[PDB]
């Protein structure tokens, strides 16, 4: 008649389904929406913050030997996904010379960070030119305008880049209701979440759960 | 598109012409002889309404200065593939058929009665024999700007004119995308625009670069094209060119090699494709207001680049000549920390 | 309004001294308009706390 | 709403002063430099310094008195000056790139001036007529219509006792009804029998159930209405009698006018704000959209069109006989096609049900008319010509089905002519307004009362030879706010309206009840004041709702009121000329 | 019927054929 | 030379022309140098957008991605349009364009095993089989008819999840982002082409509290570039008179436009805690006097 | 007999009109008191207490005009008419 | 990230309340408000009446003899009665009176455990030589349940199920207000509003709702270990 809920996991390649029931009538929708809202904006992550291109003073220019200018490579690099273990700005390197193609797998990350999608295409180089790019990896949550580095007053060789710390990509839920006249009137929530492979769905779900628990703890205290 | 429209513009005022106050109001209205020569839709919204038209798609100026319009003459009720150009006077003196009227594959008029345009403001069915001339295409009266508005046969005249005028005010974005739905007059309007380079002779590309390209002609003559990158446009926007060709491809003559502003694979692209929803939402979209998801902001979907321009000059004076110098009286070192030696 | 020269001459001949009455002239000069909160009936008001408040203020 | 980047640069001296007061800087120059650098120590002072500092907004070009309001500022991000939906009509602004300036009073006198007189909440009533202008205008009206609409045979409606089963559809209080609706067993718009406790019943039930003893909070009575109506009435100010009718725009206007004529301005503004919020909340869920399946073609238009075309061919043959001339042919064609368009419009109206979004929008008075719907679904009909005469060639298709090249070419003329007409009308109205303002600059109420006796007599309402009384169709304008010159004593010795008492809606109703027809009313045309006009003659003000106060300019108000409607004045001509 | 050599392919709701290409704009 | 009021961004290039290097220059000049400043603008509030059917608008608000309504499969929408403006303006074409865009984007496959449906008789034989993100083109005055759209919308390829989102009519079931519960009725969705107009917001926004004053007219400069105040039309004077507001008009005409000593004193009083002193004699009146006294017309004051 | 308002509209306008003869007089009748209050604040450091400070206890850094309007609603001021 | 703590303020009235939470991260306003309102409205357990009986009437079409009120009016009056029970099983209750006069909730004899928190409530009035006997059952539950869900219930003579209210709170409303903690000037300020019955205080109802919601999200938290701000 009255039992506490329980959460179980149904697994797939990269997107997992979570089933929660039994819930009281007219209550699954709100819980699912709250979880979705807290999942898509308050999951900590790490992403590139600012780059440093040797032999280039700003972003509105080109570099000999490449097929696309600086703006295109910045746009391509925005797709890069990295996970930070240290809580301080770390530095990576990207040195590729000669004809061929330069991909995400040519970066030499330091200790405590990794690149999980080596198949991305950054750009291509003609034999004439070379390339050496240094980039930073800071840890934040949400979304921050690139201009943050403008006020730091660094040297000319620094180019700000927009940071987007979010491993979650899409979330959806459907409720399976049971509106029989019996006291078994409940609903079954079916929540599905997919991540950018930076973290498995379980970690993100646990982080969101902890965030909401800490937020709602302020009400349980006797007033 | 704006440049092409300006080059195709038809002014009616200025030196040697009537003024705004003396010009009659009737001249600003349409005339049954405008069909095929001047578009009736495209027009400035301001007070200069009706004094600034635009050539039709197929309009060509005769050597004297009387606009013409192509037509195929029906000899004995059979359409003729060969076409001729007729002026206003000759057009009035003949019978012009309707392009949309069904016609059999053999050139036989299936309908005995076909609508027709007559001397002036007269339309009436006539036997399918006396008809003499037939139009070429249904799009023979629209302008270049108006010719690329899908489902133009469903909107209103004022709305169509407003959309046509709006199309000439887009801003080049950073990452353009070709429209999913659009007329077939997009690539042609881009090749003739001049803002996209094109190979002259069918050759094979040896190497390409972000700043220049080198194509090898089949006759053994090497040629190089230089593409301006990030040069301020005449109206403050940016202009760039990104080659869309690979190394080691035998590019045929007439094939686009680079895409200029508002282009995607050699075709016009003035905007992006967004998923729209039609419903009033908490009054935030009240009275023509609009709501946008932050995904567009955080993904540079509608991010543009604008380039300013400033200039200073040091001109001689009777009291002396001014000279640009790093030093300046009574200024802290921090203020001039950016100026160089010169 | 109109024909400034003629009316100016006519007024000067008669030495027509006119009080700052109406709005247009009074706004051209810049002085407070004689309307709304500008009429002398309200521009000269003296307000002080009632004696009861002062006795019981402290 | 004001962007912070603008407010901070607009309150610079006040911020600097308050900041140097708080010892965040040492001098004035350092404070100015820090404000220039925009350190995070400035935002708190900026928020503290604009607590009750009014600002002045002005949409360019201002036209009438209500074109310059005085709103309280509020910090918000972005680079756009936020605004309230209900004041856009005052400026006649459209949220599509319009720009307005923002001024700011400095001295302590201008602050009080803009806080008392120019405040927005004290100018609900337009100066043209003593009736409110800031009312649900466009979208929220649809939401209110949907909320107050009634439907039969819904889920959870009231039912009678059927033998062994009780009568279901009765709720103890609105809270239980709300909970039931939330659960999903009661549609928001259905017939219910709720038991209200904090809503005065209608007079017809108030005088019967309680025997006129007087309703007070805590008295229960069994109502018969729909939950939507109760939820709507909960927004109205307490004590107002229950309203239990569908809310068409006319009903909305009547209710708002009654509230303005029976309650103070502040209560009216508060209830209007609450009603706007409720309408915005409930408009989204009304399910009003647009799709191909919504614009439905008529079922039997083809037969009617064929018959009318056959008659057109008949008259065409008649002309071919040569008896008639071109003019008669044109007249016959135009009248035939007008009749055909009317018949097709009638058929199209008979076809659509009461569920299509177009019908719901048009019938609820939200916007538009039936002619636009007919053009969009039925027939566009004959169209104007550059000479103004109707072309003998009518269009036989609607925009939904798709026009042809010839029809569009013929149609362009109307749009061109309308554009030209608007272009000339704007300037004509502007010039007329300027002249009218010029002529009457120096009219001001000087004396409180000229104690004159000449009062123009106006026929209030005529008494029909067969009927008992017919209200004059223009009593709303001639004698609605004028001060009653002499008491309109009824046939007997009792006095229904006493001398000097200003007229109004309740007093007009009382006079109508007394059957009085001819009334002598005090008017300003016969004011005996040497300069300007005495306040008594002028009568009840427009924006104040009471007698005009001494010193208030009336000439400017009259000029603005008469000149504002000049924009819509179009064609011995009958238009603005 | 793509006159230009390598334009993108986009089939159209074509029902009638125009007997002449658009002249040089 | 300094950057004007309301500009920022990188410096991409500097061009300098010197007469020493034998560079043609306008007569009487020696060194003309021009600097280009390039700024990247992201679409923000107060920006114009409009489709190809002439439906302008402004960005009322940019909600977070987590708040917008989302399809049944979790695909949040990118823009929401009002509905009351469609039938009044009578631009129904955009609805058909949106439907066709959705159909082309989702890809379709019209059934042909039993034969071409009557509504698909005139469709080109190569247009019966499309791919996701396909490209379609409808020439003006000759395009897909209503029946063509009706047929196409009934054969769209299903999502990778195996379910079809939109119905035959073209509407779909959404889920509110705030409440979290589905809307009572379906809504129309689809892909529509959106451009970007040149009437940006950064150009329009401008403020001015205190700045350079004109030397010939003693009035503040005009224009955003010059950092000047806004104009005050006479209609505003009429409005102020209408309300009966006097001191406000006095300030607007005297203490904030012309009176020099007035401006200095009021600024100092505001900087301190002292009350604002009453305005003085506007420069316009004194100029008018000293000019009319030049025509032999003795203009007295009669302070008495 | 209505919900308490918030913002600058408190106290309401109709209540004040019950005291003052006309709205045009009230603006000056309050502005002069606000001026006196500001003068008293200016001399708070040292001087004569002839311009008695606020009658009603003020809030947390409230503008003097708000104090004047809130105390006028309390009927604590007396004034003479025009001259 | 610690960020800034969010404190829950409070306001007091006769029986209403306006709880305020300030400040909150941008977007969390509704995220709290909606779920908290739903939890408060349909989570707190309570007791109420489910069915009634009247031996003096065979069905519901007519009215009980010798009583001014009608059967529907009696049902409505008895539904609003506030009953608190501590026993799970459904217990019975009897109301009996004779002669002219009125009837009050306090006059109903309560069995062990069950109690009535409003004895002065009116139910109906009797004329001379009037009588009515009622046997109403009381059950404990949560939220709201209509009588339709209790339609099929054995076989009886005059069983008349009545829509019960298994909750001590009956109305909740909330809004969101912007706030300026920094240059962000977008932080939300939840403003809750609750109006409970006499069987619970708003603050204890809110504490119970928070307890239940925290217990529910304990499942989400327990799947792994990871921390966040205050
Ligand atoms: Mg506008
Ligand atoms: Zn008089």
Numbering used by the authors:
A (entry chain a): 4 to 226
B (entry chain c): 446 to 787
C (entry chain d): 1226 to 1283
D (entry chain d): 442 to 1012, 1024 to 1029
E (entry chain c): 29 to 53
F (entry chain c): 837 to 1140
G (entry chain e): 28 to 110
H (entry chain b): 3 to 232
What does the paper say about this structure?
Although the cryo-EM map of R1 displayed better resolved electron density for σ^B^_2_ than that of R5, in both maps the σ^B^C-terminal domain density was absent. Local resolution calculations of the R1 Eσ^B^ map showed that the central part of the Mtb RNAP core was determined at a resolution between 3.4 and 3.7 Å and displayed well defined structural elements (**[Fig fig2], Figure S4B, Figure S5**). Domain σ^B^_2_ was determined at resolution between 3.8 and 5 Å. In Eσ^B^, the β flap tip was turned 111° towards the σ^B^2 and β’ CC that is equal to its 27 Å displacement (closed flap state) ([Fig fig3]). The distance between β flap and β’ CC decreased to 46 Å ([Table tbl2]). Thus, σ^B^4 could not be correctly positioned for the −35 element promoter binding. Superposition of the Eσ^B^ structure with the published models showed that in Eσ^B^, the clamp adopted a “fully open” conformation with a rotation angle of 22° relative to σ^A^-RPo (**[Fig fig3]**) and a clamp-β lobe distance of 28 Å (**[Table tbl2]**). We concluded that the fully open clamp state observed in Eσ^B^ is characteristic of RNAP inactive state in which the σ subunit regions 3.2 and 4 are unloaded from the RNA exit channel.
In bacteria, transcription is carried out by the RNA polymerase (RNAP) core (E) composed of five subunits (α_2_ββ’ω). To initiate transcription, the core associates with the promoter-specific initiation factor σ (the σ subunit) to form the RNAP holoenzyme (Eσ). Most Mtb genes are transcribed by RNAP harboring the principal σ^A^ subunit and the principal-like σ^B^ subunit that belong to group I and group II, respectively, and share almost identical promoter binding regions. Here, we show that the stress-response σ^B^ factor from the human pathogen, *Mycobacterium tuberculosis*, induces the RNAP holoenzyme oligomerization into a supramolecular complex composed of eight RNAP units.
